[PDB]
Amino acid sequence: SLDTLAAKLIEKAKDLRAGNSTTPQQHEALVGTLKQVQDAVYLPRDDLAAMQMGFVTAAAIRLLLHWKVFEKIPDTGSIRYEELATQVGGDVVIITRICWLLVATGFLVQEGSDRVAHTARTRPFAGVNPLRAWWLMGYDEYVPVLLAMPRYYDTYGIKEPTGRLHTIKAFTEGSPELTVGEIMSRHPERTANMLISMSAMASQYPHTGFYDFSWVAPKAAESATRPLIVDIGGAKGWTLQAICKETPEIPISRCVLQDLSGVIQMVQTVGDEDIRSAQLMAIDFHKEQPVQGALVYMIRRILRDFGDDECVSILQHVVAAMAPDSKLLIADTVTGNPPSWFPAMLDFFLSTIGGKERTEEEFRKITARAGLRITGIHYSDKAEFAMIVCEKA
Amino acid sequence: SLDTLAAKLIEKAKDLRAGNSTTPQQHEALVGTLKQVQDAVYLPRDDLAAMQMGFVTAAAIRLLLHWKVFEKIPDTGSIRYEELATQVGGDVVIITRICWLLVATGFLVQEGSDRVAHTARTRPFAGVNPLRAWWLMGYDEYVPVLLAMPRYYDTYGIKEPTGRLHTIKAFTEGSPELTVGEIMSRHPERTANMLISMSAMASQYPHTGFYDFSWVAPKAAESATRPLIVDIGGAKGWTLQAICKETPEIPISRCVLQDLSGVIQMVQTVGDEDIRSAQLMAIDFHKEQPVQGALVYMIRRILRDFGDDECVSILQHVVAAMAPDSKLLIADTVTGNPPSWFPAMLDFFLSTIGGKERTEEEFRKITARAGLRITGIHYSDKAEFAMIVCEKA
Ligand SMILES: C[C@@H]1C=C[C@@H]2CCCC[C@@H]2[C@H]1C(=O)c1c(O)c([C@]2(O)CC[C@H](O)[C@@H]3O[C@@H]32)c[nH]c1=O
Ligand SMILES: C[S@@+](CC[C@H](N)C(=O)[O-])C[C@H]1O[C@@H](n2cnc3c(N)ncnc32)[C@H](O)[C@@H]1O
Ligand SMILES: C[S@@+](CC[C@H](N)C(=O)[O-])C[C@H]1O[C@@H](n2cnc3c(N)ncnc32)[C@H](O)[C@@H]1O
Numbered sequence: 001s002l003d004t005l006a007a008k009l010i011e012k013a014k015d016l017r018a019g020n021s022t023t024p025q026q027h028e029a030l031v032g033t034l035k036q037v038q039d040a041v042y043l044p045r046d047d048l049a050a051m052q053m054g055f056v057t058a059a060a061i062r063l064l065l066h067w068k069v070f071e072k073i074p075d076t077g078s079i080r081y082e083e084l085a086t087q088v089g090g091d092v093v094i095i096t097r098i099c100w101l102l103v104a105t106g107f108l109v110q111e112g113s114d115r116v117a118h119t120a121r122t123r124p125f126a127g128v129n130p131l132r133a134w135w136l137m138g139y140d141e142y143v144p145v146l147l148a149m150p151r152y153y154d155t156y157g158i159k160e161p162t163g164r165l166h167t168i169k170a171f172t173e174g175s176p177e178l179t180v181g182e183i184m185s186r187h188p189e190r191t192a193n194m195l196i197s198m199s200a201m202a203s204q205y206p207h208t209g210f211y212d213f214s215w216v217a218p219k220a221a222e223s224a225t226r227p228l229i230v231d232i233g234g235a236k237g238w239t240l241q242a243i244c245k246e247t248p249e250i251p252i253s254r255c256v257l258q259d260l261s262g263v264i265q266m267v268q269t270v271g272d273e274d275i276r277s278a279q280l281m282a283i284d285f286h287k288e289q290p291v292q293g294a295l296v297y298m299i300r301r302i303l304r305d306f307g308d309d310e311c312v313s314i315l316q317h318v319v320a321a322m323a324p325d326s327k328l329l330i331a332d333t334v335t336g337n338p339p340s341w342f343p344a345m346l347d348f349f350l351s352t353i354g355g356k357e358r359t360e361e362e363f364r365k366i367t368a369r370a371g372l373r374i375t376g377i378h379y380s381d382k383a384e385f386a387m388i389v390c391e392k393a
Numbered sequence: 394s395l396d397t398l399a400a401k402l403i404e405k406a407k408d409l410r411a412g413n414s415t416t417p418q419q420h421e422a423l424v425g426t427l428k429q430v431q432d433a434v435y436l437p438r439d440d441l442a443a444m445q446m447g448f449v450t451a452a453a454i455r456l457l458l459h460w461k462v463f464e465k466i467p468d469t470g471s472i473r474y475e476e477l478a479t480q481v482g483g484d485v486v487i488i489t490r491i492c493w494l495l496v497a498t499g500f501l502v503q504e505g506s507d508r509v510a511h512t513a514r515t516r517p518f519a520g521v522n523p524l525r526a527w528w529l530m531g532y533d534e535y536v537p538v539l540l541a542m543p544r545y546y547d548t549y550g551i552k553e554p555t556g557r558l559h560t561i562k563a564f565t566e567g568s569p570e571l572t573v574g575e576i577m578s579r580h581p582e583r584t585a586n587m588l589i590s591m592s593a594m595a596s597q598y599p600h601t602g603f604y605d606f607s608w609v610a611p612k613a614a615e616s617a618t619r620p621l622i623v624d625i626g627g628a629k630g631w632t633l634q635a636i637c638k639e640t641p642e643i644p645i646s647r648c649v650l651q652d653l654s655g656v657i658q659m660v661q662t663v664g665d666e667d668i669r670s671a672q673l674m675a676i677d678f679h680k681e682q683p684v685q686g687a688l689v690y691m692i693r694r695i696l697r698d699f700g701d702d703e704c705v706s707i708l709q710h711v712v713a714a715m716a717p718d719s720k721l722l723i724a725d726t727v728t729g730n731p732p733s734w735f736p737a738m739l740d741f742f743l744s745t746i747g748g749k750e751r752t753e754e755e756f757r758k759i760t761a762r763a764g765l766r767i768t769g770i771h772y773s774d775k776a777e778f779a780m781i782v783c784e785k786a
Contacts, residue, residue, distance in 0.1 A: 002406035006399040013395035038427050039499055044517050046424050052531045054447035056741040059539035066543040090551025104737035106432025124437045131437055146452040150459045158483030344497035348449045
C-alpha cells in the first residue's frame with residue numbers, strides 16, 4: 001500500500017543513516033512494493049506515458065553512450081556542460097537538452113545550472129562492464145527486431161517461429177537464409193560485446209542446490225568404467241565443477257564436457273585443473289552424441305534456444321546413446337501457465353531466435369517424441385528453473 | 394529525501410482514506426511522487442529490467458493491436474485463447490505466448506488455464522479513441538526515429554536540429570525535403586490517427602478551461618462576415634468545437650479551420666456536421682496566412698514543432714494578415730528550466746521534428762522578434778499550458 005511503501009522508505013533511510021547494508025531481499029521488497037502501488041494508483045494514461053518515457057530515456061542513454069559522454073562525466077563531482085561539449089566536439093545546446101531528460105528522470109543530477117554529475121544509475125555506463133554490454137546488446141540487437149515483428153508475422157503468417165532459419169532476428173538483418181550464429185560470425189564487434197553479455201546471464205541461474213546428484217556416487221563405485229555425467233554444451237565446464245565440488249564422491253575425471261572446438265580448446269588452455277582432468281570433447285549436438293552408455297546426460301539452458309523439432313533431434317541423438325538405465329537431465333525453466341514475468345519476458349525474446357520457455361506439458365510432449373518419460377521435476381527457487389529428470393520410455 | 398517522500402506518500406494515503414484525493418492535481422501530484430520514489434530507489438539492474446520489460450510489453454501490445462486481438466477480447470468476461478486464435482486466423486501457441494507476457498505484467502488477466510480478459514489497462518486498445526491514437530503515434534511514428542538518432546547526428550553533426558527540413562523524422566522516413574507535417578498528411582491512415590491523437594492527454598493539453606473567449610461574442614454582433622477565430626494548423630477543429638461549445642455565442646460558421654491539404658480533406662470524412670459547417674481551408678503556414686483581418690488567429694501546439702527562426706517566420710506571415718484590432722493567440726505548453734517530467738519527455742521527442750518545449754521567456758523572445766507585444770498570459774491551473782495573448786507592437 002502507499003503506507004507500507006512509506007514504511008520501507010523510512011526503514012531504508014534509517015539503515016543508511018546507521019551505515020548498515022540494504023540486503024538484496026530488502027531492495028527487492030522495496031521495489032516490488034513500489035510496483036504494486038504504481039499498479040494500483042496509475043491510470044492507463046499514466047501507464048502509457050511511463051512506457052513512452054522509457055523509450056526516450058533509453059534513446060538518450062544510447063545517444064550519450066554513442067557520444068562517449070558518460071566516460072567524460074567524472075566518477076564524483078561534476079563537469080560543466082560547456083566542457084563536456086568541447087570534449088565531445090559538439091553543440092552544448094543539444095548535449096545539454098539530452099542530459100536534461102536524464103536529469104528530469106533522476107539518471108543524472110545537475111550541480112548548479114552549469115554542471116552535470118553521475119548517479120549510481122549512470123556510473124555503469126561510464127566504462128566497459130557486463131551490465132553495460134548487456135544493455136547495449138539488448139538495445140542494439142533486440143529492439144529493432146521487436147519493431148520488425150508485425151512485418152515479420154505479415155510475411156511468414158501468425159505462426160510460432162520455430163526454425164533455426166528464417167528467425168525474426170535473421171529476417172530483420174536481411175539474411176533469413178542464415179542462422180543467428182552465422183550472422184553473428186559476420187559481425188566481430190557485435191559478437192565481442194555479446195560475449196561479455198553472455199557471461200552475465202549464465203552466472204545468474206543456480207548450478208546446484210536444488211537437485212541431488214549424489215545417486216551417481218554408488219554407480220561410480222560399482223563400475224570402474226561407466227562414464228558418469230556428460231555435460232552437453234557445458235561451456236567452460238562450470239556446472240561439472242560445481243557438481244563434483246558439491247559431491248566429491250563423483251570423480252570429475254569420469255565426467256565428460258562437450259562443446260564447440262573453440263570452447264574446448266580454451267578450456268584445455270586456461271581452464272582450472274579439476275575441469276581439465278575431465279574428458280573434454282568437441283561435438284555438434286545437432287548431429288551426434290559420441291559418449292555411449294553414460295549414467296547421466298545433462299542439457300542445461302540449451303533446449304530453450306530451439307524449436308520442438310530441433311529439440312527432439314538433439315534429444316534423439318542422446319536417447320540412441322543412452323543405456324536402459326541412463327538418465328537425461330534437462331536443466332531449464334518449466335514455465336507456469338500462466339508464466340511469471342521474468343520467464344515470460346525471456347520467452348518473448350526467445351521467439352526472435354526460434355526458441356521458447358516451455359511449460360511442463362510442452363516438455364512432456366517433446367520428451368515423449370524422443371522416446372523419453374519425465375520421472376521427476378525438481379524446482380530451484382529462481383523463476384521456475386528446474387531439473388527435469390528423464391528416462392527411456 | 395527518502396523521508397520527505399515517505400511523508401508525502403503517508404499524507405496522500407490519508408487523503409484517499411477520507412475521500413479527499415479527488416482532483417486531477419492531486420492525482421498528478423501522487424503520480425509524480427511515485428516517480429520520485431522510483432528515481433531515488435532504482436538501481437542499474439532495476440532500470441535494465443524496466444527498459445527490457447517496457448520494450449517487450451510495447452511490442453506485445455503492438456502485435457495484439459495489429460492482429461485485432463484486443464478488439465475480440467470482450468469488454469468483460471473472458472474468451473478462450475483458442476477462440477481468439479481462430480478468429481484472427483493465427484496459431485494459438487504464439488498468440489498465447491504473447492498474451493502471457495501481458496498477463497504477467499497485469500495488462501491482461503488469465504481466467505483458469507485457457508481464457509483471457511481485459512483489464513482497465515487494455516480496454517483503451519480495444520477500439521478507436523484518443524489515448525490509443527496517442528500511443529500509436531508514439532510507437533509507430535517516433536520509436537523508429539529514436540533508433541535513428543545516432544546515425545542522424547553522425548550525418549548532420551552534433552548540432553541542435555532546428556530546420557523544418559531534414560528533421561530526424563524525415564531522415565528516417567526517407568523524405569528529408571518534406572516537413573514532418575507534410576509527411577504525416579500524405580497517408581490517410583496516418584493522418585486519421587494523427588487527428589484523433591490531438592484529442593488525447595487533455596490532462597497536459599486542455600482544449601478549454603484556462604482562457605475565456607466570451608469577449609468574442611460581442612464583436613460577432615459588430616459584423617456579419619468578419620472571420621472570428623482562425624485555427625491555424627487546427628487539425629480536425631476539435632479545439633474550435635470545444636470553444637464554441639463553451640461560448641455558444643461564437644458561431645462555428647464564422648470560424649476558419651486551416652491545415653495542410655491532406656489533413657483538411659480528411660476532415661470531410663471524419664468531421665461531424667458541426668465542424669464541417671466551419672470555413673475549412675487548406676494552407677501552408679510556412680508561406681502564408683491567406684485570411685486577412687480576422688478577429689483572432691489561434692496558433693495551438695504549432696510553435697512547439699519548429700525552431701526559433703522558423704517560429705518567427707510563421708508568426709510574421711500571421712502578423713501581416715492581422716488588422717489593427719486583431720489578436721494572435723498562442724496556446725501551448727509552457728514549462729520551466731529544467732523542463733518538468735512530461736515536457737522533458739516531449740522536448741526529447743520534439744527534437745526529432747526540429748521542435749522543443751519552451752519557457753515563458755523563450756516564447757517572449759520569439760514573439761518580440763516577430764513584432765508582437767504580449768498583453769496577457771493565462772495559465773491552466775491543471776497543466777503547464779497557457780494562452781499567450783498577443784497584438785501587433
Ligand atoms: C511528437 C510527439 C511525439 C511523442 C509524443 C508522446 C507520444 C505520443 C505522440 C506525442 C507527439 C505529439 O505530442 C505531437 C505530434 O504528434 C506532432 C506530429 O506527430 C508531428 C507534426 C505533424 O504536423 C502532426 O502534429 C503531428 C507534433 N507535435 C507534438 O507535440
Ligand atoms: C546457452 S550456452 C551455455 C549452456 C551451458 N549448458 C550452461 O548452462 O551454461 C550453450 C552452449 O552450447 C554450445 N553449443 C552451441 N552449439 C553447439 C553444438 N552444435 N554442439 C555442441 N555445443 C554447442 C555453445 O558453445 C554454448 O557453450
Ligand atoms: C501538433 S498538431 C496540433 C493540432 C491542433 N492545433 C491541436 O493543438 O490539437 C500540428 C498541426 O499542424 C498542422 N500543420 C503542420 N504543418 C502545417 C503547415 N505547413 N500548414 C498548415 N498546417 C500544418 C498539422 O497537420 C497538425 O494538424
